[PDB]
Design a protein around this ligand. Structure first.
Ligand SMILES: *[C@@H]1O[C@H](CO[C@@H]2O[C@@H](C)[C@@H](O)[C@@H](O)[C@@H]2O)[C@@H](O[C@@H]2O[C@H](CO)[C@@H](O)[C@H](O)[C@H]2NC(C)=O)[C@H](O)[C@H]1NC(C)=O
Lengths: 181, 108, 119, 107, 108, 118, 126
């Protein structure tokens, strides 16, 4: 079951985060119990020891690449760009989070300018919603419908992922399993 | 520390194209951005990520950042966009932004 | 109904290793977890480490790597091998027992505590 | 399709040295799909390295693995009388294209 | 990461009272609480879990309820064997378990 | 609409402390990588200070210790408790928002002026 | 680990040869069966990605309309039935585990061909 979530070759960007529908599996937990050292396995809700006793039917598996110093915004209840615009996690969260350093997999010497996030937006995200729209978006008096210019901004930017950086700026691959019956 | 070099004044002719180059040592490793400075209007971005274009800006600007030097070039100038231009490079060893020294552009 | 005891604690020299021997009995030791809680006299209680019935060494941020949990199911014992004992780890170490009601986690009947002077 | 050429194909060495291989190609493939293989004269092949640096189950401590970009290299440390087989390259970036072969012999 | 708190630490009450100790937590927790009683010298002992449940051997006087970011156990019929300190706990963050600060209920 | 505003000017003798209370509109200050950028009276641009989302603060070489950067979420205001003033710091000060550090600066404030002279 | 290959076979040009492969010792699902061809002293060329639990297939380009590979879940046994046997088809056909594209979704993974089998030689010249 836990084959294409962890050991895949490509992870989509934050503003177009992936979403699986794993179902009709058995446990596939003796694998991540042996995951060590997978940086952080700070899961929330049910205890990690008591995982082979529940009967989840819709085990989700999100996945993306973010900066290391921004994985803290995945915890239920936070403030930030990735907590308000890109991906939302409700306060009453009932699921686990797994994160690990993936510098050796996605860090080009020139720079992988192929990871995107929305810097600006007028209205914060609702729980469990996508933000795939890329329309021009502005704040002011000029409607500037489609027409670019001042006060009308394009809400996309790219990550400067490089090998010879710090741990905080180094990419981290985060997979959150929002367990839900 | 990571001092950059830049010409003071363009000393250019109207109609033709002009080249502005930021000197230094090993700039190609990092990324470079560029700015425009009137005698004060809260300076606005014109070039970022080596050779990418901010939205809503004239396309006659360009960008090149290859190894020894990074270059911003203007072609078919309008002779009105005569202002100051600055380039910057970020650092990864210690968090320390370094800025340019000055470029005066004026066409008569 | 489970009686827990601990042994092996001592005023060992700094930087050495030490083996707590909580051992104990009265329950199916191969069915429940058993944790360790550090009781410093001033800063309350903090959870040292834990082990499950899978060989899964879950560790806190500071304790990770510098410690080691070891579950021997043949004879009752759970070693807590020290590594580079810091001068701040002068507290009482109780071995506890886990429990649950499906979702929530409770620290069930504790035992007693030895003393580490890290000196 | 991406052509994956490995040069040379004939190697002559004594019973024990350190050997170096090569694997060049066209437009850069990802550093996630560059598995190498070993094939003894006779029996079927087996996995040696995946992800350009990862030893498989039962792989001895004599294989390093490395590479990122367009040029890639397998470096073999020490030689044994049961390590003198042919070796292959493989990619999964664009469909699946194999290599030709790189064989190392005695003497 | 939840820094849960309480500070009616220096509680004073003579033998026999109905004083109430309140434990109010940080960023939203929900119904995640379990209680402990600690005698001096002896070992900590858990009394009430889920903030409203019952464990065998725990007298009914240590009753209480509550949910969300608010918690409460009512202590009726105070007795000399209700000495020393008391402890909260959260269980929303699974690996790094947190423990309550501490409150002392005395005899005077 | 982003209209970063700088407040607090006046004149101060060498040694006094002035609080340059910036402003914000449309974006939370305690969610971004806000930073201070100076402008000498006719010379090259320079950097001042930076506050991270987590809270880490880094400073340049020439300005170390004398300068402190805070952040009040309750008022959407970012402060700059500048102390131990010298005679070579009379400049116009700008509020700059960097989306992520490996990038440049997109939003620039109006810029208030302080006169460090007698 | 235990991957068992079928025997050899002799045939005439223009026939239809089928090669079987039975493998066991591991859960059949959550893994892919891979097929590889090796002409005498020539090299390797990819042959297919018969996968389980979905019936999905991915054949190479040189024979994009010539090979059909079906799964026998009843015994975790795989077969390839090559068609229109040509003159230059005499080769060794290798049955190996596939860890490149996965089983459930279509997406590449870090890995390769884990365990191989024994091998079989199809004799088709005359
Ligand atoms: C992701 O893959 C790794 C590595 O996979 C191994 O190599 C492949 C070529 C193939 O042979 C796989 O079957 C191998 O497992 C997995 O890491 C291994 O996990 C097994 C679990 O049984 C363990 O015995 C091995 O020791 C692990 N390898 C190492 C080097 O420690 C990993 O489990 C996979 N992750 C998931 C979630 O599927």
């Amino acid at each position: 079951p836990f084959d294409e979530v962890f050991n895949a070759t490509r992870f989509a960007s934050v503003y177009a985060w992936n979403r699986k529908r794993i179902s009709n599996c058995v446990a596939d937990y003796s694998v991540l119990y042996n995951f060590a050292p997978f940086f952080a396995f700070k899961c929330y809700g049910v205890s990690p020891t008591k995982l082979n006793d529940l009967c989840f039917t819709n085990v989700y598996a999100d996945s993306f690449v973010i900066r290391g110093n921004e994985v803290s915004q995945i915890a239920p209840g936070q403030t930030g760009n990735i907590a308000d615009y890109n991906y939302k996690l409700p306060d009453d969260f009932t699921g686990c989070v797994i994160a690990w350093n993936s510098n050796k997999l996605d860090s080009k010497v020139g720079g992988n300018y192929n990871y995107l996030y929305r810097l600006f937006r007028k209205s914060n995200l609702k729980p469990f919603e996508r933000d795939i729209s890329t329309e021009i978006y502005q704040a002011g008096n000029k409607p500037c419908n489609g027409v670019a210019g001042f006060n009308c901004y394009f809400p996309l930017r790219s990550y400067g992922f490089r090998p010879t950086y710090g741990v905080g700026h180094q990419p981290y691959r985060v997979v959150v399993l929002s367990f839900e019956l | 520390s990571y001092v950059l070099t830049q010409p003071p004044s363009v000393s250019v002719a109207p109609g033709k194209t002009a080249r502005i180059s930021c000197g230094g040592n090993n700039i190609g490793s990092y990324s470079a951005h560029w700015y425009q400075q009137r005698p004060g209007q809260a300076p606005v971005l014109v070039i970022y990520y080596d050779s990418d274009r901010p939205s809503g800006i004239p396309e006659r600007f360009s960008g090149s950042n290859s190894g020894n030097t990074a270059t911003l070039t203007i072609s078919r100038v309008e002779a009105g966009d005569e202002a100051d231009y600055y380039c910057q490079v970020w650092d990864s060893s210690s968090d320390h932004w370094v800025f340019g020294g000055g470029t005066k552009l004026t066409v008569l | 109904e489970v009686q827990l005891v601990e042994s092996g604690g001592g005023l060992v020299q700094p930087g050495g290793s030490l083996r707590l021997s909580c051992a104990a009995s009265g329950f199916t030791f191969s069915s429940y977890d058993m944790h360790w809680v550090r009781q410093t006299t001033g800063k309350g209680l903090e959870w040292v480490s834990t082990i499950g019935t899978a060989g899964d060494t879950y560790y806190p941020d500071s304790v990770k790597g510098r410690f080691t949990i070891s579950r021997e199911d043949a004879k009752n014992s759970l070693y807590l091998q020290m590594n580079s004992l810091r001068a701040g780890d002068t507290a009482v170490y109780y071995c506890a027992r886990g429990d649950s009601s499906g979702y929530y986690y409770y620290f069930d009947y504790w035992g007693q505590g030895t003393l580490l002077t890290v000196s | 399709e991406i052509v994956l050429t490995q040069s040379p194909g004939t190697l002559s060495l004594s019973p024990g040295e350190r050997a170096t291989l090569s694997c060049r190609a066209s437009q850069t493939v990802s550093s996630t799909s560059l598995a190498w293989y070993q094939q003894k004269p006779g029996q079927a092949p087996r996995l040696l390295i995946y992800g350009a640096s990862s030893r498989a189950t039962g792989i001895p401590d004599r294989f390093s693995g490395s590479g990122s970009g367009t040029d890639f290299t397998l470096t073999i440390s020490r030689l044994e009388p049961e390590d003198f087989a042919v070796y292959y390259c493989q990619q999964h970036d664009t469909s699946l294209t194999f290599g030709g072969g790189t064989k190392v012999e005695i003497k | 990461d939840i820094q849960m708190t309480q500070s009616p630490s220096s509680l004073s009450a003579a033998v026999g009272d109905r004083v109430t100790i309140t434990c109010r937590a940080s960023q939203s927790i929900g119904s995640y609480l379990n209680w402990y009683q600690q005698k001096p010298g002896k070992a900590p002992k858990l009394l009430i879990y889920a903030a409203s449940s019952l464990q065998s051997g725990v007298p009914s006087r240590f009753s209480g309820s509550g949910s969300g970011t608010d918690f409460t156990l009512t202590i009726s019929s105070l007795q000399p064997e209700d000495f020393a300190i008391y402890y909260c706990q959260q269980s929303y963050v699974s690996p790094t378990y947190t423990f309550g600060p501490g409150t002392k209920v005395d005899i005077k | 609409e982003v209209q970063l505003v700088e407040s607090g000017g006046g004149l101060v003798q060498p040694g006094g402390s002035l609080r340059l209370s910036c402003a914000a509109s449309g974006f939370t200050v305690s969610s971004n990588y806000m930073s201070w950028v100076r402008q000498a009276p006719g010379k090259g641009l320079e950097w001042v200070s930076v506050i991270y989302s987590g809270g880490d603060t880094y400073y340049p070489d020439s300005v170390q210790g004398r300068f402190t950067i805070s952040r009040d979420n309750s008022k959407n205001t970012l402060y700059l408790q500048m102390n131990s003033l010298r005679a070579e710091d009379t400049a116009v000060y700008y509020c700059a928002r960097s989306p992520t550090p490996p990038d440049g600066f997109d939003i620039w404030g109006q810029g208030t002026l302080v006169t460090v002279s007698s | 680990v235990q991957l068992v290959q079928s025997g050899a076979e002799v045939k005439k040009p223009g026939a239809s040869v089928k090669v079987s492969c039975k493998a066991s010792g591991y859960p059949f699902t959550s893994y892919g069966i891979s097929w590889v061809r090796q002409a005498p002293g020539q090299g390797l060329e990819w042959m297919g990605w018969i996968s389980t639990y979905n019936g999905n297939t991915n054949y190479a380009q040189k024979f994009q309309g010539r090979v059909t590979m079906t799964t026998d879940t009843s015994t975790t046994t795989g077969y390839m039935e090559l068609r229109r046997l040509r003159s230059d088809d005499t080769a060794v056909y290798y049955c190996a585990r596939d860890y490149t594209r996965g089983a459930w979704f279509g997406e590449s993974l870090i890995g390769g061909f884990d365990n191989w089998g024994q091998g079989t030689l199809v004799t088709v010249s005359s």
